[PDB]
Design a binder for this molecule. Structure first.
Ligand SMILES: [Mg+2]
Ligand SMILES: [Mg+2]
Ligand SMILES: [Mg+2]
Ligand SMILES: [Mg+2]
Ligand SMILES: [Mg+2]
Ligand SMILES: [Mg+2]
Ligand SMILES: [Mg+2]
Ligand SMILES: [Mg+2]
Ligand SMILES: [Mg+2]
Ligand SMILES: [Mg+2]
Ligand SMILES: [Mg+2]
Ligand SMILES: [Mg+2]
Ligand SMILES: [Mg+2]
Ligand SMILES: [Mg+2]
Ligand SMILES: [Mg+2]
Ligand SMILES: [Mg+2]
Ligand SMILES: [Mg+2]
Lengths: 63, 25, 97, 226, 127
RNA sequence: UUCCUCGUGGCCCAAUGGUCACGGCGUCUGGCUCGAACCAGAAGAUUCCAGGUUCAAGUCCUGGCGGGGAAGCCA
RNA sequence: AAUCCUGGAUGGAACGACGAA
RNA sequence: GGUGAAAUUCUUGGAUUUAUUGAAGACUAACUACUGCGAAAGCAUUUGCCAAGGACGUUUUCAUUAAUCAAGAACGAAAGUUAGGGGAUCGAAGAUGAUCAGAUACCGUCGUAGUCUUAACCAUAAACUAUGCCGACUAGGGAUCGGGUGGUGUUUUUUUAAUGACCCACUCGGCACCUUACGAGAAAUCAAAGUCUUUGGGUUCUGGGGGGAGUAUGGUCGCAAGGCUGAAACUUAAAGGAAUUG
């Protein structure tokens, strides 16, 4: 039953056609020095914490 | 209509008329 | 009327240029009316390079690069958020950004 | 995609990595390192004799891995298996070739590319197709932005190059040629012969390929592996 | 110290192949695709599928005896795209993160000297 | 004339003797939108007519009604 | 006083309207 | 596999994939650009042969031999035709899978003719710079291709020479380009589309509202496909070009 905690360090922007998604670059609490970009469904701040059911995935960054 | 296809129609009708006239000639 | 003096292209003294194919829609477009870009990129990305260097024997290595030249037709280049569309006065601007 | 197959079988487990064995690869002595890696085969049955299934194998590996230096980092070498003596299988030179990254890095626009290729045979009765490549350069004090040649310079350069390779191969057997290749003396000769004609940067040679080999002559092979 | 293999990612659109061999290429290990790790026909190409494939081949190589791997990334090439698909770099990152070691990545997309002819017509694949 | 076959909702068509009977189109109602197309949904059958077998016939059997097909040869 | 670096995409369906002014 | 998504299709007889070779035929990437040559069409791997050509240079030669040209002749993309060859890719037709109200269309998978060549026909094209050729003159500016001249200019050789490659200045000729309008133009725009009511340098071709109609007929060429030539009846008040604001 593994899950990964990740701390938010930077909110990038909203995403999704209807704006109910947010891109965030996080910092893994355990195994620090690792930063990954993820989608989020709800509201989010910097320094919030996320429970990744899987860590080995990042979203297509909107650039 | 498109002039290209109108031309194609004239060409077909010319062919038609040419052979239906060869029927007599 | 005449939208462009070059008419779309770079054919002055040639007659014929022996076209190429759009890599997106396989359309036979002349090599001069096309739009040539060059996608010079690192092979992996900005992200996983750190993981690769961590997991790499042969340190200091290179991270070599992938170079591919791209031709697009007008329609595909305009659909793919490239040369899109400009005003009558800025059409004459011939340099890149 | 998984449960899609209509039929797996037209008409209607034994995992093999227990059935296999490892060998380690020895390169010739014209290389500061011999131990290339390892390979696999099935166990030598009586109806197979795995030696012969493994005889005609080819393995491409980097010259920087054979020499240690990352200066020869592009420069892949293909090695052909020719003999086996108890799990330390020997190889001989099959052919060189560059990496696409380096080649495309050379190929930039607003400079003229020159290419040559010759079909020469050696002292050891081999036949090789040696490829040479070169590129114009923009001199210092130069203001115009392309540095193209006048297309007879190119023909002269190519004549010179082809004559040099036909001269330098005839006399080099195969290992003599390999040890001429590795230090990149040929490129120095091309530059010294063409500086009187045109600048010529990036005179790395190019891939070389065998076409037809002589008879085996195991003695000449074992001469290399000491 | 390190036992080397060769990974041979072929990352097209519509699918992704991770399949690893000895240095010679004649003897192979652990060919798995994206469509073996997903059931759509629409996500055969995707990075998650490629990542799962790379995890599987990492497991199989490690239980064979292979520790490091060289990489040859490839697209459909020829007359076709020549730009690699989405799931190549994902597989690469995945087999790196799984515990294997890397050496000498290369791109080996087959390129022609103006070979035969692309498909679609001269007017193209319209849509 | 003989032989063979067919008949089912407005149209085409299917049915194991075992529910006043399946489907598609059409029709009616509502919705999206003015109409189509689309989405939801309804209703409509004396299974050609007269008899018989059976607990029960659309079906199984006899007769007629109408439609079609094949045959009508040696001279 | 230490100190190696980056930029980047596509993605279904959608017929029609009397003329006059 | 392919796709927007699927399906047709191939796969325990091992498909896709890997490596090693071999064959076939086509093509000639990246270099490849507001660059070159060519009468145009058009022409891009190497080397060899064959003949030709432009520009440049010239204190060489003839000496008006010239410019444009109904007739008439040569070349003339692709498709197409005939006959052989070759026939890998792609692929009018056709067959199929889907999409769709229908889809003998777009998309997908196959796939004949064709795509390549030889010998011979065709004789067309948005064959377009939609701009006839020859000639003279008229504003600035720089870049570039080829040739040539000059410079104690830079670099390499053998510090050094001659070369070659670069730099600067200039020049003839060419593909073009930028800026302005003294000018022109209906304007868009044009260093030619200027020097044209202050109307004439020379010459060839074509057009006369829109349709009917590049039609019918008659000739002529062509194996054919068709080409070149080419009306009338009847019909109509607008068709059209360039810009303007919506
Ligand atoms: Mg043309
Ligand atoms: Mg209704
Ligand atoms: Mg209607
Ligand atoms: Mg109508
Ligand atoms: Mg196989
Ligand atoms: Mg080439
Ligand atoms: Mg040139
Ligand atoms: Mg014409
Ligand atoms: Mg014209
Ligand atoms: Mg003039
Ligand atoms: Mg000059
Ligand atoms: Mg000039
Ligand atoms: Mg020119
Ligand atoms: Mg008139
Ligand atoms: Mg008229
Ligand atoms: Mg009126
Ligand atoms: Mg208008």
């Amino acid at each position: 039953t593994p899950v990964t905690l990740a701390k938010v360090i930077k909110v990038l922007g909203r995403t999704g056609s209807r704006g109910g998604v947010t891109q965030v670059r996080v910092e893994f609490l355990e195994d620090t020095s690792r930063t990954i970009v993820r989608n989020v469904k709800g509201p989010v701040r910097e320094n919030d914490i996320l429970v990744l059911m899987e860590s080995e995935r990042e979203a297509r960054r909107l650039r | 209509m498109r002039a290209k296809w109108r031309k194609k129609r004239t060409r077909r009708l010319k062919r038609k008329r040419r052979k239906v006239r060869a029927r007599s000639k | 009327p005449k939208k462009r003096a070059s008419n779309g292209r770079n054919k002055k003294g040639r007659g014929h240029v022996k076209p190429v194919r759009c890599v997106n829609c396989s359309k036979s477009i002349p090599k001069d009316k096309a739009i040539k870009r060059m996608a010079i990129r690192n092979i992996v990305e900005a992200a996983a390079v750190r993981d690769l260097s961590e997991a790499s024997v042969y340190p200091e290595y290179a991270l070599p690069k992938t170079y591919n030249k791209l031709h697009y037709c007008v329609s595909c280049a305009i659909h793919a958020r490239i040369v899109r569309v400009r005003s009558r006065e800025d059409r004459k601007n011939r340099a890149p950004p | 995609a998984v449960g899609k197959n209509k039929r797996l079988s037209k008409g209607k487990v034994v995992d093999p990595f227990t059935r296999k064995e490892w060998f380690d690869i020895k390169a010739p002595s014209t290389f500061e390192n011999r131990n290339v890696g390892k390979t696999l085969v099935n166990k030598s049955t009586g109806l197979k004799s795995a030696s012969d299934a493994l005889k005609g194998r080819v393995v491409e590996v980097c010259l920087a891995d054979l020499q240690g230096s990352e200066d020869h980092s592009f420069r892949k070498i293909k090695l052909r298996v020719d003999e086996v003596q108890g799990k330390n299988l020997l190889t001989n030179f099959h052919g060189m070739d560059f990496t696409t990254d380096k080649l495309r890095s050379m190929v930039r626009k607003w400079q003229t590319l020159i290419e040559a290729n010759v079909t020469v045979k050696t002292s050891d009765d081999y036949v090789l197709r040696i490829f040479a490549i070169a590129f114009t350069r923009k001199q210092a004090n130069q203001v115009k932005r392309h540095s193209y040649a006048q297309s007879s310079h190119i023909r002269a350069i190519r004549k010179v190059i082809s004559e040099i390779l036909t001269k330098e191969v005839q006399g080099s057997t195969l290992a003599q040629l390999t040890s001429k290749l590795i230090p990149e003396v040929i490129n120095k000769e091309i530059e010294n012969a063409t500086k009187d004609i045109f600048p010529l940067q990036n005179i790395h040679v190019r891939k070389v390929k065998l076409l037809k080999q002589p008879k085996f002559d195991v003695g000449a092979l074992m001469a290399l592996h000491g | 110290s390190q036992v080397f293999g060769v990974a041979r990612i072929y990352a097209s659109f519509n699918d992704t192949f991770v399949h690893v061999t000895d240095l010679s290429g004649k003897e192979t290990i652990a060919r798995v695709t994206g469509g073996m790790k997903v059931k759509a026909d629409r996500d055969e190409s995707s990075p998650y599928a490629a990542m799962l494939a790379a995890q599987d081949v990492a497991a199989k190589c490690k239980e064979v005896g292979i520790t490091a791997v060289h990489v040859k990334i490839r697209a459909t090439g020829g007359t076709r795209t020549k730009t690699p698909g989405p799931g190549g770099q994902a597989a690469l990152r995945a087999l790196a993160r799984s515990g294997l070691r890397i050496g000498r990545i290369e791109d080996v997309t087959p390129v022609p000297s103006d070979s035969t002819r692309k498909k679609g017509g001269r007017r193209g694949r319209r849509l």
